[model samples]
Target chain A: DAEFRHDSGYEVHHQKLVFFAGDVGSNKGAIIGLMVGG
Target chain B: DAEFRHDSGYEVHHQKLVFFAGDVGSNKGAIIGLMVGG
Candidate 1:
């Protein structure tokens, strides 16, 4: 139900995984986050 | 460039924010996560 892109460019220090999610719905525009400690 | 939904139904605790990202692209389907310890 979504599309995401892993941005290694933002993965500084290798501490987290940065992902960009696009094309969802209201108040849901652009959801990005990090995979920390795992 | 994304759309997201906050599922309060899945937010079992007030300790984290649960968001589901959808309609992105290949391998980017349904990106979901939690905002922990913050």
Candidate 2:
């Protein structure tokens, strides 16, 4: 679940949500993204 | 915010929430996590 890998401080217009990648429970879903802060 | 980096099917005791890492609006605060699916 590799994200867009936007750790370089890229800004999206009017975007308030952020995403991170991970697995759910024991199952690894495709692109399991979560919200997070920098 | 390189979360515990647990992509290896790890388990937390009664952990009901999920987390991802990213910036909020352009602000980089410490440990900004959120909820996700199972």
Candidate 3:
């Protein structure tokens, strides 16, 4: 669990939401360049 | 993969983000009554 002090940490999809799930190998926020960075 | 068009789908805690992750057994949005339905 990390601190989401950024803006609305959410994204829009056809039928699913790709949230900023922190990757154990990337930065605090990183996931397929889906604006996981705030 | 549903839809995230509601308010904010995030909750800030001590150090965790209780995102409304739609459970395979739940509706489009339903998780511990955390406003997952939106």
TM-score of chain A considered alone, across all candidate predictions: 0.19, 0.18, 0.15
lDDT of 2 by residue, B1-38 (tens): 34333233433332223245332343233443434445
Highest lDDT: give the candidate number.
1
Runs in model 1 lying further than 4 Å from the true structure: A1-18, A28-38, B1-21, B24-34
lDDT of 3 by residue, B1-38 (tens): 34334355554433234243332332232223222222
| Candidate 2: tens digits of C-alpha lDDT, residues A1-38 | 34332233332332223344332343222442345434
Q: Local distance difference test, per candidate?
A: 0.36, 0.35, 0.33
* Shift of residue B33 alpha carbon in model 3, Å: 23
> Model 2, stretches more than 4 Å misplaced?
A1-38, B1-18, B21-23, B32-38
What TM-score would each prediction reach against the true structure?
Answer: 0.19, 0.15, 0.14
Return the lDDT, model 3, position A15: 28
lDDT of 1 by residue, B1-38 (tens): 57554432321212122243234334434343544443
Model 2 clash pairs? Answer: A38-B28
lDDT of 3 by residue, A1-38 (tens): 33334356655433233343222332332223212221
Give model 2's TM-score versus the native structure: 0.15
